[PDB]
CSV table of C-alpha atoms and ligand atoms in Angstrom, one decimal:
chain,number,residue,atom,x,y,z
K,1,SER,CA,-49.5,-40.8,-81.9
K,2,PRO,CA,-52.7,-40.0,-80.8
K,3,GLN,CA,-53.8,-41.0,-77.1
K,4,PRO,CA,-54.5,-44.8,-76.9
K,5,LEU,CA,-58.4,-44.2,-77.1
K,6,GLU,CA,-58.3,-41.7,-79.8
K,7,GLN,CA,-56.2,-44.1,-81.7
K,8,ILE,CA,-58.3,-47.1,-81.2
K,9,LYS,CA,-61.4,-44.8,-82.1
K,10,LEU,CA,-59.4,-43.5,-85.4
K,11,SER,CA,-58.9,-47.3,-86.1
K,12,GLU,CA,-62.5,-48.4,-85.9
K,13,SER,CA,-63.8,-45.4,-88.0
K,14,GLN,CA,-61.0,-46.3,-90.6
K,15,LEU,CA,-61.5,-50.3,-90.7
K,16,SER,CA,-65.6,-49.9,-90.3
K,17,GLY,CA,-64.6,-52.8,-87.7
K,18,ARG,CA,-64.4,-53.0,-83.6
K,19,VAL,CA,-61.5,-52.9,-81.8
K,20,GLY,CA,-61.0,-54.6,-78.2
K,21,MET,CA,-58.1,-53.9,-75.9
K,22,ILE,CA,-56.9,-54.2,-72.5
K,23,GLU,CA,-53.6,-52.7,-70.9
K,24,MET,CA,-53.0,-54.9,-67.3
K,25,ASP,CA,-50.1,-55.2,-64.6
K,26,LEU,CA,-48.6,-58.6,-65.2
K,27,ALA,CA,-48.1,-58.8,-61.4
K,28,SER,CA,-51.5,-57.3,-59.8
K,29,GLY,CA,-53.8,-57.2,-62.4
K,30,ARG,CA,-54.2,-53.6,-62.4
K,31,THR,CA,-55.9,-52.5,-65.6
K,32,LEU,CA,-54.2,-49.5,-67.0
K,33,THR,CA,-56.8,-48.6,-69.9
K,34,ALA,CA,-59.1,-50.6,-72.0
K,35,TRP,CA,-61.9,-50.2,-74.7
K,36,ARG,CA,-64.9,-52.9,-75.3
K,37,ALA,CA,-62.8,-55.1,-72.9
K,38,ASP,CA,-65.7,-57.0,-72.2
K,39,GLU,CA,-67.0,-57.5,-75.3
K,40,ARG,CA,-66.5,-61.0,-77.2
K,41,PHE,CA,-64.1,-61.4,-79.9
K,42,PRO,CA,-62.7,-64.7,-81.9
K,43,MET,CA,-59.4,-65.8,-80.4
K,44,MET,CA,-58.3,-67.1,-83.8
K,45,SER,CA,-54.7,-68.7,-83.1
K,46,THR,CA,-54.0,-66.4,-79.6
K,47,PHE,CA,-55.9,-69.5,-78.4
K,48,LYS,CA,-53.0,-71.4,-78.8
K,49,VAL,CA,-50.8,-69.7,-76.0
K,50,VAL,CA,-54.3,-70.9,-73.6
K,51,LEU,CA,-53.8,-74.3,-75.0
K,52,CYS,CA,-50.2,-74.7,-74.2
K,53,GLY,CA,-51.1,-73.5,-70.7
K,54,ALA,CA,-53.5,-76.4,-70.1
K,55,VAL,CA,-51.1,-78.9,-71.6
K,56,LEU,CA,-48.4,-77.6,-69.0
K,57,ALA,CA,-51.2,-77.9,-66.1
K,58,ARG,CA,-51.1,-81.7,-67.1
K,59,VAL,CA,-47.5,-81.8,-67.0
K,60,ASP,CA,-47.9,-80.6,-63.4
K,61,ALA,CA,-50.4,-82.7,-62.2
K,62,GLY,CA,-48.2,-85.7,-63.5
K,63,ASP,CA,-50.5,-86.4,-66.4
K,64,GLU,CA,-48.4,-85.5,-69.6
K,65,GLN,CA,-44.7,-85.1,-70.1
K,66,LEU,CA,-43.3,-82.6,-72.3
K,67,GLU,CA,-40.7,-85.2,-73.4
K,68,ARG,CA,-43.8,-87.4,-74.8
K,69,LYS,CA,-43.4,-88.3,-78.3
K,70,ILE,CA,-46.5,-88.1,-80.5
K,71,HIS,CA,-46.8,-90.1,-84.0
K,72,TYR,CA,-49.5,-88.8,-86.2
K,73,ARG,CA,-50.3,-89.5,-89.7
K,74,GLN,CA,-50.8,-87.2,-93.1
K,75,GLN,CA,-54.5,-87.4,-92.4
K,76,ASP,CA,-54.4,-86.0,-89.1
K,77,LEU,CA,-52.9,-82.7,-90.7
K,78,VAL,CA,-55.0,-79.5,-91.4
K,79,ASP,CA,-54.0,-76.4,-93.6
K,80,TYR,CA,-50.9,-74.4,-92.2
K,81,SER,CA,-48.5,-77.1,-90.6
K,82,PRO,CA,-45.1,-75.7,-91.5
K,83,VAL,CA,-43.5,-77.7,-88.7
K,84,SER,CA,-45.6,-80.4,-88.3
K,85,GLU,CA,-45.8,-81.6,-92.1
K,86,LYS,CA,-42.3,-82.2,-91.5
K,87,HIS,CA,-42.5,-85.0,-89.1
K,88,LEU,CA,-44.7,-87.5,-90.4
K,89,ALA,CA,-41.7,-89.9,-89.8
K,90,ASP,CA,-40.1,-89.3,-86.5
K,91,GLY,CA,-42.9,-87.7,-84.8
K,92,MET,CA,-42.8,-84.4,-82.3
K,93,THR,CA,-42.9,-84.3,-78.3
K,94,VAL,CA,-45.3,-82.5,-76.8
K,95,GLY,CA,-43.1,-79.7,-76.0
K,96,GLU,CA,-41.8,-79.5,-79.8
K,97,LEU,CA,-45.7,-79.3,-80.0
K,98,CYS,CA,-46.6,-76.4,-78.3
K,99,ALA,CA,-43.2,-74.7,-79.3
K,100,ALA,CA,-44.3,-75.3,-82.9
K,101,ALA,CA,-48.4,-74.3,-82.0
K,102,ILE,CA,-47.0,-70.8,-80.6
K,103,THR,CA,-44.0,-69.7,-82.3
K,104,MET,CA,-44.9,-70.8,-85.8
K,105,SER,CA,-48.6,-71.1,-85.2
K,106,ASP,CA,-48.6,-74.4,-86.5
K,107,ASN,CA,-52.3,-75.5,-86.7
K,108,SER,CA,-52.0,-79.3,-86.6
K,109,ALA,CA,-49.6,-79.1,-83.8
K,110,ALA,CA,-52.4,-77.2,-81.9
K,111,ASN,CA,-55.0,-79.7,-82.8
K,112,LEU,CA,-53.0,-82.7,-81.6
K,113,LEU,CA,-52.2,-80.8,-78.2
K,114,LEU,CA,-55.9,-80.2,-78.3
K,115,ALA,CA,-56.7,-83.6,-78.6
K,116,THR,CA,-54.5,-84.6,-75.2
K,117,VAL,CA,-56.7,-81.7,-73.2
K,118,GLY,CA,-60.2,-83.3,-74.0
K,119,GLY,CA,-60.6,-81.3,-77.2
K,120,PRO,CA,-62.1,-77.7,-77.2
K,121,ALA,CA,-64.6,-79.1,-74.5
K,122,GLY,CA,-61.6,-80.1,-72.5
K,123,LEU,CA,-59.8,-76.8,-72.7
K,124,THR,CA,-63.1,-75.1,-71.9
K,125,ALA,CA,-63.3,-77.1,-68.6
K,126,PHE,CA,-59.7,-75.8,-67.9
K,127,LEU,CA,-60.9,-72.5,-68.4
K,128,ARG,CA,-63.5,-72.9,-65.8
K,129,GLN,CA,-61.2,-74.6,-63.4
K,130,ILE,CA,-58.9,-71.5,-63.4
K,131,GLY,CA,-62.1,-69.4,-62.8
K,132,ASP,CA,-62.2,-68.1,-66.6
K,133,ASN,CA,-66.1,-68.3,-67.1
K,134,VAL,CA,-66.2,-66.2,-70.1
K,135,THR,CA,-63.6,-67.6,-73.0
K,136,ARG,CA,-64.5,-70.7,-74.7
K,137,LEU,CA,-63.3,-72.9,-77.2
K,138,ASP,CA,-65.7,-75.4,-79.5
K,139,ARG,CA,-63.9,-76.1,-82.7
K,140,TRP,CA,-60.6,-77.3,-83.7
K,141,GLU,CA,-58.0,-75.5,-86.5
K,142,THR,CA,-58.9,-74.3,-88.7
K,143,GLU,CA,-62.9,-74.0,-88.5
K,144,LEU,CA,-62.3,-71.8,-85.1
K,145,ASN,CA,-61.2,-68.7,-87.2
K,146,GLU,CA,-64.8,-68.8,-88.8
K,147,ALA,CA,-65.7,-65.3,-87.1
K,148,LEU,CA,-69.5,-65.1,-87.6
K,149,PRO,CA,-71.1,-62.3,-86.3
K,150,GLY,CA,-73.1,-62.8,-83.0
K,151,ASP,CA,-71.3,-66.5,-82.6
K,152,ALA,CA,-69.7,-67.2,-79.2
K,153,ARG,CA,-68.1,-70.0,-80.2
K,154,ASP,CA,-64.1,-69.6,-80.2
K,155,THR,CA,-64.4,-66.1,-78.3
K,156,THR,CA,-62.8,-64.3,-75.2
K,157,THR,CA,-63.0,-60.6,-74.1
K,158,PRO,CA,-59.6,-58.7,-73.8
K,159,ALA,CA,-60.4,-58.7,-69.9
K,160,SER,CA,-61.0,-62.2,-69.6
K,161,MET,CA,-57.8,-62.9,-71.9
K,162,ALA,CA,-55.5,-60.9,-70.0
K,163,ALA,CA,-57.0,-62.0,-66.7
K,164,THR,CA,-56.4,-65.9,-67.9
K,165,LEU,CA,-52.7,-65.1,-69.3
K,166,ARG,CA,-51.8,-63.3,-65.8
K,167,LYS,CA,-53.4,-66.4,-64.2
K,168,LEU,CA,-51.3,-69.0,-66.4
K,169,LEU,CA,-47.9,-66.8,-66.3
K,170,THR,CA,-47.7,-65.6,-62.5
K,171,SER,CA,-50.4,-66.9,-60.1
K,172,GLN,CA,-48.5,-70.4,-59.2
K,173,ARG,CA,-51.2,-72.3,-60.7
K,174,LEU,CA,-48.8,-73.6,-63.1
K,175,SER,CA,-45.2,-74.9,-61.6
K,176,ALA,CA,-42.4,-72.1,-61.7
K,177,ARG,CA,-40.9,-74.4,-64.4
K,178,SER,CA,-44.2,-74.3,-66.5
K,179,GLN,CA,-44.8,-70.5,-65.8
K,180,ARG,CA,-41.3,-70.2,-67.0
K,181,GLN,CA,-41.9,-72.4,-70.1
K,182,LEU,CA,-45.0,-70.7,-71.2
K,183,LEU,CA,-43.2,-67.5,-71.2
K,184,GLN,CA,-40.2,-68.5,-73.4
K,185,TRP,CA,-42.6,-69.9,-76.0
K,186,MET,CA,-44.3,-66.2,-76.2
K,187,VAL,CA,-40.6,-64.8,-76.3
K,188,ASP,CA,-39.9,-67.0,-79.2
K,189,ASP,CA,-42.5,-66.4,-81.4
K,190,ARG,CA,-41.1,-66.5,-84.9
K,191,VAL,CA,-44.4,-65.0,-86.5
K,192,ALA,CA,-44.3,-61.4,-85.8
K,193,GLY,CA,-41.6,-61.3,-82.7
K,194,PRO,CA,-38.5,-60.6,-84.6
K,195,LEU,CA,-40.3,-57.8,-86.9
K,196,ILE,CA,-42.1,-56.3,-83.8
K,197,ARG,CA,-38.8,-56.3,-81.8
K,198,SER,CA,-37.0,-54.7,-84.8
K,199,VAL,CA,-39.8,-51.5,-84.7
K,200,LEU,CA,-39.9,-51.1,-81.1
K,201,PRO,CA,-37.6,-48.4,-79.3
K,202,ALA,CA,-35.1,-49.8,-77.6
K,203,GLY,CA,-35.5,-51.2,-74.0
K,204,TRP,CA,-38.6,-52.8,-74.8
K,205,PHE,CA,-39.5,-56.1,-73.9
K,206,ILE,CA,-41.8,-58.1,-76.2
K,207,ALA,CA,-43.2,-61.6,-76.1
K,208,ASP,CA,-46.5,-62.5,-78.0
K,209,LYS,CA,-48.8,-64.8,-80.0
K,210,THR,CA,-50.5,-63.4,-82.9
K,211,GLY,CA,-54.0,-64.8,-84.7
K,212,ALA,CA,-55.7,-64.0,-87.7
K,213,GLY,CA,-59.4,-65.0,-89.0
K,214,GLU,CA,-62.3,-64.5,-91.3
K,215,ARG,CA,-64.2,-61.2,-92.1
K,216,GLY,CA,-61.0,-58.9,-91.0
K,217,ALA,CA,-60.5,-60.9,-87.6
K,218,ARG,CA,-56.9,-60.4,-86.6
K,219,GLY,CA,-55.5,-59.7,-83.0
K,220,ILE,CA,-52.3,-60.0,-80.6
K,221,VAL,CA,-51.7,-61.1,-77.1
K,222,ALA,CA,-48.4,-59.8,-75.7
K,223,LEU,CA,-46.3,-59.1,-72.9
K,224,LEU,CA,-44.5,-55.7,-73.2
K,225,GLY,CA,-42.9,-53.3,-70.9
K,226,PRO,CA,-40.0,-50.6,-70.8
K,227,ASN,CA,-36.5,-51.8,-69.1
K,228,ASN,CA,-36.5,-55.2,-70.6
K,229,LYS,CA,-39.2,-56.4,-68.2
K,230,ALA,CA,-42.6,-57.8,-69.1
K,231,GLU,CA,-44.2,-55.4,-67.0
K,232,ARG,CA,-47.8,-55.6,-68.7
K,233,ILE,CA,-49.9,-57.7,-70.9
K,234,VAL,CA,-51.7,-56.1,-73.8
K,235,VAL,CA,-54.5,-57.9,-75.7
K,236,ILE,CA,-55.6,-56.6,-79.0
K,237,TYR,CA,-58.6,-57.9,-81.0
K,238,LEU,CA,-60.1,-56.3,-84.3
K,239,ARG,CA,-63.0,-58.2,-85.8
K,240,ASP,CA,-65.9,-57.5,-88.6
K,241,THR,CA,-63.9,-55.1,-91.2
K,242,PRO,CA,-63.6,-55.6,-95.2
K,243,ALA,CA,-60.0,-53.8,-95.1
K,244,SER,CA,-56.8,-55.5,-96.4
K,245,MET,CA,-54.5,-57.7,-94.4
K,246,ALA,CA,-52.2,-54.7,-94.4
K,247,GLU,CA,-54.3,-52.2,-93.0
K,248,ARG,CA,-55.4,-54.7,-90.0
K,249,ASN,CA,-52.0,-55.3,-89.2
K,250,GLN,CA,-51.0,-51.4,-89.4
K,251,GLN,CA,-53.9,-50.3,-87.4
K,252,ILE,CA,-52.8,-52.9,-84.8
K,253,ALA,CA,-49.3,-51.3,-85.0
K,254,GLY,CA,-50.5,-47.7,-84.6
K,255,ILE,CA,-52.5,-48.4,-81.6
K,256,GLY,CA,-49.6,-50.5,-80.1
K,257,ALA,CA,-47.5,-47.1,-80.8
K,258,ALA,CA,-50.1,-45.1,-79.1
K,259,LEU,CA,-49.8,-47.3,-76.1
K,260,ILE,CA,-46.1,-47.3,-76.0
K,261,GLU,CA,-45.9,-43.8,-76.3
K,262,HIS,CA,-48.7,-42.8,-73.7
K,263,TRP,CA,-47.2,-45.8,-71.5
K,264,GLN,CA,-48.4,-44.7,-67.9
K,265,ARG,CA,-46.4,-45.5,-64.3
O,1,MA4,O1,-41.5,-41.4,-77.9
O,1,MA4,C1,-41.6,-42.7,-77.7
O,1,MA4,C2,-41.0,-43.3,-79.1
O,1,MA4,O2,-41.6,-42.9,-79.8
O,1,MA4,C3,-41.2,-43.7,-81.1
O,1,MA4,O3,-41.2,-45.1,-81.1
O,1,MA4,C4,-42.4,-45.8,-82.0
O,1,MA4,C5,-41.4,-46.6,-83.0
O,1,MA4,O4,-40.8,-45.9,-83.9
O,1,MA4,C6,-42.7,-47.1,-83.8
O,1,MA4,O5,-41.9,-48.2,-84.7
O,1,MA4,C7,-43.4,-48.0,-82.7
O,1,MA4,O6,-44.3,-48.9,-83.3
O,1,MA4,C8,-44.9,-49.9,-82.1
O,1,MA4,C9,-44.4,-51.2,-83.0
O,1,MA4,C10,-45.9,-51.9,-83.6
O,1,MA4,C11,-45.7,-53.4,-83.1
O,1,MA4,C12,-47.0,-54.0,-83.1
O,1,MA4,C13,-47.5,-53.8,-81.7
O,1,MA4,C14,-47.8,-54.8,-80.7
O,1,MA4,C15,-46.8,-54.4,-79.6
O,1,MA4,C16,-47.3,-55.5,-78.5
O,1,MA4,C17,-48.7,-55.2,-77.9
O,1,MA4,C18,-49.4,-54.2,-78.8
O,1,MA4,C19,-49.3,-55.1,-80.2
O,1,MA4,O7,-44.1,-47.3,-81.8
O,1,MA4,C20,-43.2,-46.6,-81.1
O,1,MA4,C21,-44.2,-45.4,-80.3
O,1,MA4,O8,-44.9,-44.5,-81.0
O,1,MA4,C22,-39.7,-43.3,-81.6
O,1,MA4,O9,-39.4,-43.9,-82.9
O,1,MA4,C23,-38.8,-43.8,-80.3
O,1,MA4,O10,-37.4,-42.9,-80.7
O,1,MA4,C24,-39.6,-43.2,-79.1
O,1,MA4,O11,-38.8,-43.9,-77.9
O,2,CZ6,C1,-56.1,-79.3,-69.1
O,2,CZ6,C2,-57.0,-80.1,-68.0
O,2,CZ6,C3,-58.4,-80.4,-68.6
O,2,CZ6,C4,-59.5,-81.5,-67.9
O,2,CZ6,C5,-59.9,-81.8,-69.1
O,2,CZ6,C6,-60.1,-80.4,-67.2
O,2,CZ6,O1,-58.6,-82.2,-67.2
O,2,CZ6,B1,-57.2,-81.9,-66.5
O,2,CZ6,C7,-56.6,-82.8,-66.0
O,2,CZ6,N1,-57.5,-84.3,-65.8
O,2,CZ6,C8,-57.6,-85.0,-67.0
O,2,CZ6,O2,-57.2,-84.9,-67.6
O,2,CZ6,C9,-58.5,-86.1,-66.7
O,2,CZ6,N2,-57.8,-87.5,-66.8
O,2,CZ6,O3,-56.6,-87.5,-66.9
O,2,CZ6,C10,-56.1,-89.1,-66.6
O,2,CZ6,C11,-56.2,-89.9,-67.7
O,2,CZ6,C12,-54.2,-88.9,-66.5
O,2,CZ6,C13,-56.8,-89.6,-65.2
O,2,CZ6,O4,-56.2,-89.3,-64.2
O,2,CZ6,O5,-57.7,-90.4,-65.7
O,2,CZ6,C14,-60.0,-86.4,-66.7
O,2,CZ6,C15,-60.5,-84.9,-66.9
O,2,CZ6,S1,-62.1,-85.1,-66.9
O,2,CZ6,C16,-62.0,-86.9,-67.1
O,2,CZ6,N3,-63.0,-87.6,-66.9
O,2,CZ6,N4,-60.8,-87.2,-67.1
O,2,CZ6,O6,-56.6,-81.2,-67.9
O,3,CB4,C1,-49.6,-66.7,-88.8
O,3,CB4,C2,-51.2,-66.3,-88.4
O,3,CB4,C3,-51.5,-65.1,-89.4
O,3,CB4,O1,-51.5,-67.4,-88.9
O,3,CB4,N1,-51.9,-68.1,-89.9
O,3,CB4,C4,-53.0,-68.9,-90.3
O,3,CB4,C5,-53.6,-69.7,-89.5
O,3,CB4,O2,-54.2,-70.9,-90.0
O,3,CB4,N2,-54.0,-69.2,-88.3
O,3,CB4,C6,-54.8,-69.8,-87.7
O,3,CB4,B1,-55.2,-69.1,-86.1
O,3,CB4,O3,-55.3,-67.7,-86.3
O,3,CB4,O4,-56.0,-70.1,-85.4
O,3,CB4,C7,-52.6,-69.6,-91.5
O,3,CB4,C8,-53.2,-70.4,-92.4
O,3,CB4,S1,-52.4,-70.6,-94.0
O,3,CB4,C9,-51.6,-69.3,-93.9
O,3,CB4,N3,-50.5,-69.0,-94.7
O,3,CB4,N4,-51.2,-68.5,-92.6
O,3,CB4,C10,-51.3,-66.1,-87.2
O,3,CB4,O5,-51.3,-66.9,-86.4
O,3,CB4,O6,-51.0,-64.6,-87.2
């Protein structure tokens, strides 16, 4: 495969869209490589990881419990709720909701959790508290996927998203158990995880959350490394391309392949 930036250029040329990318050491925050890493992209469903970071923060503070059962109504549901639509009778625990939000991309699960942290405004306040002055959530599922050009709503940058994920996973802002839990949920992704793992070379650790939006928007936040270690955070976003979903997936895959083949020490 081409060198990562070579591949990214080919991708933008072929898609007529923008790509944003960063690869960053999990432990130290050392940036290995980056492209448009300070440009804004819609987070889409990638925000679900940050959301559950916020939820875990509330658990650590004694404001919430992963065990707490939330009961909700059919009228609370939005588009794409494969897990949550199954539990109108019995409800779901906060932890179960995070699991459904991260591992199945369940939108109503996400909205229910979003309510517990003070809505988009509350999640944005949480981001500011952990020193992310860039990322912002403004809407709920599914409006937050609108991806209007020039709209700052519901956006991050690759560099801010990677820094924030690192903060959530390793900085001891969250408790030891909470850090472990957030990791677990990403390891357990059911949307793309098993497929990615199936096509990764042997020895490569994967944990991830994907996202998709309008106008071609597509993305992934991932923990990746050789030697079965979560060595690095990789963020790849795509925006403003008329291309097929198949082509968007393949391009992100080819950028991933480039990063893997050309992994530096
Ligand atoms: O020489 C290095 C490697 O090159 C290839 O491996 C390929 C593999 O055959 C392909 O299937 C994968 O696709 C990448 C997997 C796509 C998954 C999506 C990408 C995600 C991953 C997490 C962050 C970025 C986005 O690329 C690697 C690297 O070229 C060879 O098949 C393999 O034997 C060899 O060890
Ligand atoms: C993820 C972050 C999001 C956010 C919103 C930054 O705050 B925290 C933690 N703090 C609170 O949730 C909180 N009240 O919690 C209870 C109700 C327990 C209380 O102490 O009264 C609160 C925040 S602003 C306001 N007026 N009240 O979670
Ligand atoms: C699984 C996938 C593509 O997300 N799929 C969604 C969806 O609504 N995602 C919202 B997120 O990108 O804010 C969806 C709606 S109807 C349908 N089918 N899928 C993702 O998160 O990657």
